[PDB]
């Protein structure tokens, strides 16, 4: 039925967005003896934190350096500011402490994802998306040979097992492998859902595609409340994977109660489609995974993203039916690109405006995804329609490369967002040439 696949391409969105909350990095500082030892450290904890940790980014105490000896020269206003030397610091050998106000436990606070290993979280997202790519590439022959229902049930069981395992992962590589297998099963379920919704009913293909997109949006909106309700990432993953264990009951229906010509032929349309899919993947899996910097409140940001993406992807079908495929797609791409660029243009103090621009950009890239999905069914004739598979593969590759460009934040906090805003502009300018 349609409602079952809607629930199960919600919970998939919930599982995908769980990385945006479980991998969130709270405000952390170096473990200092004058702040975490017994009472003998003494009053005025702010002064102790200032004299125990040097300043860093955003005029805040350095999250990566600690003073070996208390520098009393910094607290006295009669002494000059920034008088300490670099040799007085240490590379945080004693460890780090994290703020338990917003999140009680995360994968960053558990395995100490700090500046020395800050690339692990984008590397974790890249490994997750690589597992998605591997699953989407492998489940093809599996679904073609063993049947779609068998591979669907196996992928559901694998999802549940890997979620339950990652909810209690003792090490970082073990958690990475668990996420890799979970992404394999996620991509299997995604491919099965797509290939089933493409030919179950269909004239109603755009209608069922927009229904699946609205289900995805419902999942986007529900995962925010789920993360707001559960402050522990372990219990969060547990209660997110439990619905898959419940949906596993539908196995076996309650127990019975090649195509390489896409490159030479229509090469222009092919490369344009792969470029749009790559751009969509890039922006979506680079922006939806770092919502902490795009707004002030991650839960409210995701809620607004969902509540504004619902009508956007709703009216996307009206726009496609009235104005056409190419013009509305180019318009949505250019709008998303301009919004993400203005998100870097606006100062960081305008948090509400930054959040609104992020929501608008996410709605625009979702509308662009809907538009390219509708357009892929008509860009190529029936004799060439694995063009859609190549487009999805290019989108998954762009997704994989997504978190890898986030490492450019060392050279500047706007460079990843600058790329995420510049790519859709060129994507729309290239799609404007479509027939
Ligand atoms: O075509 C493909 O299957 C890969 S496209 C892609 N890239 N990042 C992501 Br999230 N997705 C997406 C993958 C899958 C879906 C739906 C549930 C079936 C999505 C729905 C809306 C937006 C993006 C989606």
Short mmCIF file of C-alpha atoms and ligand atoms in Angstrom, two decimals:
data_model
loop_
_atom_site.label_atom_id
_atom_site.label_comp_id
_atom_site.label_asym_id
_atom_site.label_seq_id
_atom_site.Cartn_x
_atom_site.Cartn_y
_atom_site.Cartn_z
CA UNK A 1 0.00 0.00 0.00
CA UNK A 2 0.97 3.66 -0.34
CA UNK A 3 0.77 4.57 3.36
CA UNK A 4 3.22 1.80 4.28
CA UNK A 5 5.83 3.09 1.83
CA UNK A 6 5.16 6.64 3.03
CA UNK A 7 5.88 5.58 6.62
CA UNK A 8 8.89 3.74 5.37
CA UNK A 9 10.35 6.53 3.45
CA UNK A 10 9.86 8.71 6.46
CA UNK A 11 11.57 6.60 8.86
CA UNK A 12 14.33 6.51 6.22
CA UNK A 13 14.49 10.31 6.32
CA UNK A 14 14.56 10.08 10.12
CA UNK A 15 17.50 7.67 9.97
CA UNK A 16 19.30 9.90 7.46
CA UNK A 17 18.82 13.05 9.56
CA UNK A 18 19.77 11.24 12.79
CA UNK A 19 23.38 12.00 11.84
CA UNK A 20 22.65 15.74 12.04
CA UNK A 21 21.79 15.41 15.76
CA UNK A 22 23.89 12.46 16.97
CA UNK A 23 27.07 13.97 15.47
CA UNK A 24 26.38 17.48 16.80
CA UNK A 25 29.41 19.02 18.52
CA UNK A 26 28.46 21.05 21.63
CA UNK A 27 30.55 23.75 23.26
CA UNK A 28 33.60 21.99 24.69
CA UNK A 29 36.73 23.01 26.58
CA UNK A 30 39.94 21.40 27.78
CA UNK A 31 39.92 19.40 31.01
CA UNK A 32 41.55 21.71 33.56
CA UNK A 33 42.50 20.95 37.18
CA UNK A 34 41.22 24.34 38.38
CA UNK A 35 37.75 23.56 36.98
CA UNK A 36 37.11 19.79 37.29
CA UNK A 37 39.01 18.75 40.44
CA UNK A 38 37.79 18.87 44.05
CA UNK A 39 36.89 22.01 46.01
CA UNK A 40 40.61 22.83 46.49
CA UNK A 41 40.60 24.62 43.11
CA UNK A 42 39.29 27.79 44.80
CA UNK A 43 34.65 31.28 43.37
CA UNK A 44 34.11 33.19 40.10
CA UNK A 45 34.31 30.23 37.67
CA UNK A 46 34.48 32.62 34.70
CA UNK A 47 37.78 34.07 35.94
CA UNK A 48 39.15 30.57 36.51
CA UNK A 49 38.15 29.53 32.99
CA UNK A 50 39.75 32.69 31.58
CA UNK A 51 43.04 32.21 33.44
CA UNK A 52 43.08 28.45 32.74
CA UNK A 53 42.28 28.53 29.00
CA UNK A 54 43.57 31.11 26.47
CA UNK A 55 41.15 32.88 24.12
CA UNK A 56 40.38 31.37 20.74
CA UNK A 57 37.86 31.65 17.92
CA UNK A 58 35.01 34.16 18.27
CA UNK A 59 36.81 35.68 21.30
CA UNK A 60 35.83 32.56 23.26
CA UNK A 61 38.18 30.37 25.34
CA UNK A 62 40.26 28.15 23.07
CA UNK A 63 38.58 24.76 22.67
CA UNK A 64 41.96 23.21 21.82
CA UNK A 65 44.52 24.75 24.23
CA UNK A 66 44.95 24.83 28.01
CA UNK A 67 47.34 26.65 30.32
CA UNK A 68 49.74 24.48 32.31
CA UNK A 69 50.00 27.17 35.01
CA UNK A 70 47.36 29.71 36.06
CA UNK A 71 48.12 32.98 34.26
CA UNK A 72 47.04 35.60 36.80
CA UNK A 73 48.24 38.42 34.51
CA UNK A 74 45.15 38.05 32.30
CA UNK A 75 42.57 38.66 35.04
CA UNK A 76 44.14 41.89 36.31
CA UNK A 77 42.89 44.81 34.16
CA UNK A 78 46.05 46.81 34.91
CA UNK A 79 48.10 44.34 32.85
CA UNK A 80 48.07 44.30 29.06
CA UNK A 81 45.77 41.87 27.28
CA UNK A 82 47.09 38.87 25.34
CA UNK A 83 50.43 38.82 27.18
CA UNK A 84 50.77 35.04 27.45
CA UNK A 85 53.22 33.09 25.29
CA UNK A 86 52.52 30.14 23.03
CA UNK A 87 54.90 27.88 24.98
CA UNK A 88 52.66 28.16 28.06
CA UNK A 89 49.98 26.04 26.35
CA UNK A 90 49.65 22.29 25.80
CA UNK A 91 47.82 20.26 23.10
CA UNK A 92 45.05 19.26 25.54
CA UNK A 93 46.60 16.06 26.86
CA UNK A 94 44.23 15.72 29.84
CA UNK A 95 41.11 15.43 27.66
CA UNK A 96 38.00 17.50 27.01
CA UNK A 97 34.68 18.15 28.75
CA UNK A 98 31.43 18.82 26.91
CA UNK A 99 28.30 20.82 27.71
CA UNK A 100 25.46 18.52 28.78
CA UNK A 101 22.81 21.26 28.54
CA UNK A 102 21.46 20.67 25.02
CA UNK A 103 22.71 17.12 24.37
CA UNK A 104 23.40 14.58 27.10
CA UNK A 105 25.60 12.30 24.97
CA UNK A 106 26.76 12.44 21.35
CA UNK A 107 29.27 10.62 19.17
CA UNK A 108 31.49 13.72 19.34
CA UNK A 109 31.55 13.79 23.15
CA UNK A 110 31.96 10.00 23.42
CA UNK A 111 34.94 9.36 21.11
CA UNK A 112 36.48 12.85 21.58
CA UNK A 113 35.97 14.30 18.10
CA UNK A 114 38.16 17.35 18.72
CA UNK A 115 40.32 19.59 16.48
CA UNK A 116 42.96 16.84 16.30
CA UNK A 117 40.31 14.49 14.87
CA UNK A 118 37.71 17.03 13.71
CA UNK A 119 37.78 15.48 10.23
CA UNK A 120 36.24 12.27 11.61
CA UNK A 121 32.63 13.51 11.55
CA UNK A 122 32.79 14.57 7.87
CA UNK A 123 34.72 11.34 7.26
CA UNK A 124 31.93 9.45 9.04
CA UNK A 125 29.31 11.12 6.84
CA UNK A 126 31.43 10.35 3.76
CA UNK A 127 31.69 6.69 4.77
CA UNK A 128 27.92 6.61 5.32
CA UNK A 129 27.26 8.02 1.85
CA UNK A 130 29.85 5.66 0.34
CA UNK A 131 27.95 2.78 1.93
CA UNK A 132 24.79 4.25 0.40
CA UNK A 133 26.48 4.23 -3.01
CA UNK A 134 27.73 0.65 -2.54
CA UNK A 135 24.28 -0.54 -1.50
CA UNK A 136 22.57 1.20 -4.42
CA UNK A 137 25.10 -0.35 -6.81
CA UNK A 138 24.92 -3.84 -5.29
CA UNK A 139 21.19 -4.30 -4.62
CA UNK A 140 20.48 -4.06 -8.36
CA UNK A 141 21.40 -7.63 -9.28
CA UNK A 142 20.22 -8.79 -5.84
CA UNK A 143 16.73 -7.38 -6.38
CA UNK A 144 16.72 -8.63 -9.98
CA UNK A 145 17.61 -12.21 -8.97
CA UNK A 146 16.16 -12.85 -5.50
CA UNK A 147 13.06 -10.71 -6.01
CA UNK A 148 12.15 -7.29 -4.65
CA UNK A 149 10.27 -8.42 -1.53
CA UNK A 150 13.10 -10.71 -0.38
CA UNK A 151 15.76 -8.00 -0.67
CA UNK A 152 13.37 -5.48 0.91
CA UNK A 153 12.83 -7.70 3.96
CA UNK A 154 16.55 -8.48 4.18
CA UNK A 155 17.39 -4.77 4.02
CA UNK A 156 14.81 -4.00 6.72
CA UNK A 157 16.31 -6.68 8.97
CA UNK A 158 19.82 -5.35 8.28
CA UNK A 159 18.64 -1.81 9.07
CA UNK A 160 17.19 -2.91 12.41
CA UNK A 161 20.26 -4.98 13.32
CA UNK A 162 22.78 -2.27 12.41
CA UNK A 163 20.76 0.39 14.23
CA UNK A 164 20.59 -1.72 17.38
CA UNK A 165 24.33 -2.39 17.08
CA UNK A 166 25.34 1.24 16.49
CA UNK A 167 23.17 2.26 19.45
CA UNK A 168 25.76 0.46 21.61
CA UNK A 169 28.96 0.82 19.60
CA UNK A 170 32.03 0.68 21.89
CA UNK A 171 34.53 2.06 19.37
CA UNK A 172 34.61 4.59 16.54
CA UNK A 173 35.64 2.18 13.72
CA UNK A 174 32.97 -0.29 14.85
CA UNK A 175 30.39 2.51 14.76
CA UNK A 176 31.66 3.49 11.30
CA UNK A 177 31.25 -0.07 10.01
CA UNK A 178 27.79 -0.29 11.57
CA UNK A 179 26.81 2.96 9.84
CA UNK A 180 28.27 1.62 6.57
CA UNK A 181 26.09 -1.50 6.74
CA UNK A 182 23.08 0.55 7.85
CA UNK A 183 23.59 2.80 4.82
CA UNK A 184 23.89 -0.26 2.58
CA UNK A 185 20.49 -1.45 3.81
CA UNK A 186 19.08 2.10 3.59
CA UNK A 187 20.12 2.36 -0.06
CA UNK A 188 18.63 -1.06 -0.75
CA UNK A 189 15.30 0.04 0.71
CA UNK A 190 15.53 3.31 -1.22
CA UNK A 191 16.11 1.57 -4.55
CA UNK A 192 13.30 -0.90 -3.87
CA UNK A 193 10.86 1.87 -2.92
CA UNK A 194 11.79 3.86 -6.02
CA UNK A 195 11.50 0.95 -8.45
CA UNK A 196 8.17 -0.05 -6.88
CA UNK A 197 6.59 3.42 -6.83
CA UNK A 198 7.72 4.02 -10.41
CA UNK A 199 5.60 1.16 -11.80
CA UNK A 200 2.92 0.28 -9.21
CA UNK A 201 0.25 2.69 -10.49
CA UNK A 202 1.68 4.40 -13.59
CA UNK A 203 -0.05 8.99 -15.64
CA UNK A 204 0.04 9.11 -11.83
CA UNK A 205 3.85 8.85 -11.72
CA UNK A 206 4.37 12.55 -10.81
CA UNK A 207 1.58 12.25 -8.23
CA UNK A 208 3.13 9.25 -6.47
CA UNK A 209 6.57 10.87 -6.73
CA UNK A 210 5.27 14.02 -5.04
CA UNK A 211 3.59 11.82 -2.42
CA UNK A 212 6.93 10.12 -1.71
CA UNK A 213 8.57 13.56 -1.53
CA UNK A 214 5.92 14.70 0.96
CA UNK A 215 6.59 11.54 2.98
CA UNK A 216 10.28 12.42 2.99
CA UNK A 217 9.36 15.93 4.16
CA UNK A 218 7.16 14.44 6.90
CA UNK A 219 10.19 12.44 8.00
CA UNK A 220 12.29 15.61 7.97
CA UNK A 221 9.73 17.23 10.26
CA UNK A 222 9.32 14.21 12.53
CA UNK A 223 13.02 13.53 13.14
CA UNK A 224 13.37 17.02 14.65
CA UNK A 225 10.73 16.26 17.29
CA UNK A 226 12.20 12.79 17.83
CA UNK A 227 15.64 14.29 18.51
CA UNK A 228 14.06 16.95 20.73
CA UNK A 229 12.34 14.25 22.79
CA UNK A 230 15.36 11.97 23.21
CA UNK A 231 18.53 13.73 24.37
CA UNK A 232 20.69 10.58 24.25
CA UNK A 233 21.93 9.46 20.83
CA UNK A 234 21.89 5.78 21.86
CA UNK A 235 18.23 5.76 22.89
CA UNK A 236 17.53 8.01 19.89
CA UNK A 237 18.92 5.45 17.45
CA UNK A 238 17.12 2.70 19.39
CA UNK A 239 13.69 4.34 19.10
CA UNK A 240 14.39 5.23 15.47
CA UNK A 241 15.33 1.64 14.53
CA UNK A 242 12.44 0.11 16.51
CA UNK A 243 9.87 1.09 13.81
CA UNK A 244 11.91 -0.93 11.32
CA UNK A 245 11.75 -3.94 13.64
CA UNK A 246 7.98 -3.37 13.73
CA UNK A 247 7.68 -3.07 9.94
CA UNK A 248 9.65 -6.32 9.62
CA UNK A 249 6.38 -8.06 10.58
CA UNK A 250 5.18 -7.58 6.98
CA UNK A 251 7.83 -10.02 5.71
CA UNK A 252 6.56 -12.41 3.01
CA UNK A 253 3.19 -10.62 3.20
CA UNK A 254 2.46 -12.06 6.66
CA UNK A 255 3.69 -15.46 5.42
CA UNK A 256 1.13 -15.57 2.59
CA UNK A 257 -1.58 -14.67 5.14
CA UNK A 258 24.54 -3.12 -19.90
CA UNK A 259 22.78 0.07 -21.04
CA UNK A 260 26.13 1.79 -21.62
CA UNK A 261 24.81 3.74 -24.64
CA UNK A 262 23.80 6.66 -22.39
CA UNK A 263 27.22 8.32 -22.73
CA UNK A 264 27.50 8.52 -26.56
CA UNK A 265 23.79 9.00 -27.29
CA UNK A 266 22.32 12.32 -26.14
CA UNK A 267 25.59 13.22 -24.44
CA UNK A 268 24.53 16.81 -23.76
CA UNK A 269 21.29 15.81 -22.02
CA UNK A 270 23.17 13.08 -20.15
CA UNK A 271 25.88 15.35 -18.76
CA UNK A 272 23.33 18.05 -17.90
CA UNK A 273 21.19 15.54 -15.98
CA UNK A 274 24.22 14.18 -14.11
CA UNK A 275 25.30 17.74 -13.32
CA UNK A 276 21.90 18.67 -11.86
CA UNK A 277 21.78 15.45 -9.83
CA UNK A 278 25.35 16.00 -8.59
CA UNK A 279 24.47 19.56 -7.58
CA UNK A 280 21.34 18.42 -5.74
CA UNK A 281 23.26 15.71 -3.90
CA UNK A 282 26.10 18.09 -3.03
CA UNK A 283 23.86 20.81 -1.59
CA UNK A 284 21.40 18.48 0.16
CA UNK A 285 23.92 16.25 1.91
CA UNK A 286 26.26 19.15 2.66
CA UNK A 287 23.67 21.49 4.18
CA UNK A 288 21.25 19.11 5.93
CA UNK A 289 24.15 17.58 7.89
CA UNK A 290 25.49 20.84 9.40
CA UNK A 291 22.31 22.58 10.59
CA UNK A 292 24.11 23.73 13.75
CA UNK A 293 25.85 26.56 11.88
CA UNK A 294 22.93 27.37 9.55
CA UNK A 295 20.68 28.47 12.42
CA UNK A 296 20.55 29.16 16.14
CA UNK A 297 18.16 26.32 17.09
CA UNK A 298 18.61 23.05 15.21
CA UNK A 299 15.19 21.64 16.13
CA UNK A 300 13.33 24.82 15.19
CA UNK A 301 15.44 25.07 12.03
CA UNK A 302 14.49 21.55 10.93
CA UNK A 303 10.83 22.15 11.83
CA UNK A 304 10.73 25.31 9.70
CA UNK A 305 12.58 23.48 6.91
CA UNK A 306 9.87 20.83 6.86
CA UNK A 307 6.93 23.21 7.21
CA UNK A 308 8.21 25.36 4.32
CA UNK A 309 9.30 22.41 2.14
CA UNK A 310 5.83 20.84 2.36
CA UNK A 311 4.12 23.58 0.28
CA UNK A 312 7.17 24.06 -1.95
CA UNK A 313 7.28 20.44 -3.10
CA UNK A 314 3.47 20.47 -3.11
CA UNK A 315 3.24 23.32 -5.63
CA UNK A 316 6.25 21.95 -7.51
CA UNK A 317 3.90 19.69 -9.49
CA UNK A 318 1.61 22.62 -10.33
CA UNK A 319 4.66 24.57 -11.49
CA UNK A 320 5.88 21.65 -13.61
CA UNK A 321 2.43 21.25 -15.18
CA UNK A 322 1.94 24.97 -15.87
CA UNK A 323 5.31 26.49 -16.80
CA UNK A 324 7.10 23.29 -17.86
CA UNK A 325 10.08 21.26 -16.71
CA UNK A 326 13.17 23.31 -17.58
CA UNK A 327 12.05 26.85 -16.56
CA UNK A 328 10.74 25.99 -13.09
CA UNK A 329 13.75 23.74 -12.43
CA UNK A 330 16.19 26.50 -13.41
CA UNK A 331 14.22 28.99 -11.31
CA UNK A 332 14.30 26.75 -8.23
CA UNK A 333 18.02 26.06 -8.69
CA UNK A 334 18.85 29.76 -9.07
CA UNK A 335 16.68 30.64 -6.07
CA UNK A 336 18.38 28.03 -3.87
CA UNK A 337 21.82 29.17 -5.03
CA UNK A 338 21.07 32.84 -4.39
CA UNK A 339 19.61 32.01 -0.97
CA UNK A 340 22.66 29.99 0.08
CA UNK A 341 24.97 32.73 -1.22
CA UNK A 342 23.07 35.42 0.69
CA UNK A 343 23.32 33.15 3.74
CA UNK A 344 27.06 33.85 3.60
CA UNK A 345 26.48 37.48 2.58
CA UNK A 346 24.29 38.20 5.63
CA UNK A 347 26.23 38.77 8.88
CA UNK A 348 26.06 36.01 11.46
CA UNK A 349 24.23 38.25 13.96
CA UNK A 350 21.00 38.07 11.90
CA UNK A 351 20.18 34.57 13.08
CA UNK A 352 16.53 34.67 12.03
CA UNK A 353 17.43 35.86 8.53
CA UNK A 354 20.15 33.19 8.26
CA UNK A 355 17.67 30.50 9.32
CA UNK A 356 15.08 31.76 6.83
CA UNK A 357 17.66 31.70 4.03
CA UNK A 358 18.70 28.16 4.97
CA UNK A 359 15.07 27.00 4.97
CA UNK A 360 14.50 28.67 1.60
CA UNK A 361 17.60 27.03 0.15
CA UNK A 362 16.56 23.60 1.40
CA UNK A 363 13.07 24.04 -0.04
CA UNK A 364 14.60 25.15 -3.33
CA UNK A 365 16.94 22.17 -3.60
CA UNK A 366 14.06 19.85 -2.73
CA UNK A 367 11.95 21.40 -5.49
CA UNK A 368 14.94 21.02 -7.82
CA UNK A 369 15.20 17.33 -6.90
CA UNK A 370 11.50 16.86 -7.66
CA UNK A 371 11.96 18.71 -10.96
CA UNK A 372 14.95 16.64 -12.09
CA UNK A 373 13.17 13.43 -11.05
CA UNK A 374 10.18 14.41 -13.19
CA UNK A 375 12.43 15.50 -16.07
CA UNK A 376 14.53 12.31 -16.12
CA UNK A 377 11.49 10.32 -17.28
CA UNK A 378 11.28 12.45 -20.45
CA UNK A 379 14.85 13.55 -21.22
CA UNK A 380 15.62 10.12 -22.69
CA UNK A 381 13.50 7.77 -24.82
CA UNK A 382 12.24 4.42 -23.59
CA UNK A 383 15.20 2.66 -25.23
CA UNK A 384 17.53 4.66 -22.95
CA UNK A 385 15.24 5.26 -19.95
CA UNK A 386 19.81 3.32 -17.33
CA UNK A 387 19.85 7.11 -17.54
CA UNK A 388 17.88 7.48 -14.30
CA UNK A 389 20.26 5.05 -12.61
CA UNK A 390 23.28 7.01 -13.83
CA UNK A 391 21.66 10.20 -12.55
CA UNK A 392 21.05 8.68 -9.12
CA UNK A 393 24.64 7.40 -9.08
CA UNK A 394 25.96 10.88 -9.89
CA UNK A 395 23.74 12.34 -7.17
CA UNK A 396 25.11 9.81 -4.67
CA UNK A 397 28.65 10.69 -5.73
CA UNK A 398 27.95 14.37 -5.20
CA UNK A 399 26.51 13.50 -1.80
CA UNK A 400 29.69 11.57 -0.95
CA UNK A 401 31.84 14.53 -1.99
CA UNK A 402 29.56 16.78 0.08
CA UNK A 403 31.12 16.39 3.54
CA UNK A 404 34.61 16.31 2.01
CA UNK A 405 34.30 19.97 0.99
CA UNK A 406 33.27 20.91 4.55
CA UNK A 407 36.92 20.43 5.58
CA UNK A 408 37.60 23.80 3.89
CA UNK A 409 36.21 25.50 7.01
CA UNK A 410 39.77 25.92 8.29
CA UNK A 411 40.49 28.43 5.52
CA UNK A 412 37.17 30.16 6.22
CA UNK A 413 33.75 29.45 7.72
CA UNK A 414 31.99 30.61 4.53
CA UNK A 415 33.89 28.51 1.96
CA UNK A 416 31.69 25.37 2.26
CA UNK A 417 28.54 27.50 2.14
CA UNK A 418 30.10 29.53 -0.69
CA UNK A 419 30.47 26.31 -2.69
CA UNK A 420 26.98 25.14 -1.69
CA UNK A 421 25.64 28.43 -3.05
CA UNK A 422 27.78 28.65 -6.18
CA UNK A 423 27.12 25.09 -7.41
CA UNK A 424 23.31 25.51 -7.84
CA UNK A 425 23.83 28.74 -9.82
CA UNK A 426 26.00 26.97 -12.40
CA UNK A 427 23.65 23.97 -12.32
CA UNK A 428 20.68 26.17 -13.21
CA UNK A 429 22.66 28.07 -15.84
CA UNK A 430 23.53 24.74 -17.46
CA UNK A 431 19.98 23.36 -17.18
CA UNK A 432 18.63 26.51 -18.85
CA UNK A 433 20.01 25.12 -22.14
CA UNK A 434 17.83 22.00 -21.99
CA UNK A 435 15.29 21.51 -24.83
O1 LIG B 1 17.47 9.26 -6.40
C1 LIG B 1 17.92 8.76 -5.33
O2 LIG B 1 17.44 7.68 -4.89
C2 LIG B 1 19.05 9.47 -4.57
S1 LIG B 1 18.68 11.26 -4.46
C3 LIG B 1 19.15 11.88 -2.81
N1 LIG B 1 20.27 12.49 -2.51
N2 LIG B 1 20.25 12.79 -1.20
C4 LIG B 1 19.12 12.36 -0.70
BR1 LIG B 1 18.57 12.52 1.16
N3 LIG B 1 18.41 11.78 -1.69
C5 LIG B 1 17.09 11.16 -1.57
C6 LIG B 1 16.98 9.77 -1.57
C7 LIG B 1 15.72 9.17 -1.47
C8 LIG B 1 14.58 9.95 -1.36
C9 LIG B 1 13.19 9.28 -1.24
C10 LIG B 1 12.61 8.40 -0.12
C11 LIG B 1 12.72 7.85 -1.54
C12 LIG B 1 14.69 11.36 -1.36
C13 LIG B 1 13.53 12.16 -1.25
C14 LIG B 1 13.64 13.55 -1.24
C15 LIG B 1 14.89 14.15 -1.35
C16 LIG B 1 16.03 13.37 -1.46
C17 LIG B 1 15.93 11.96 -1.46
#
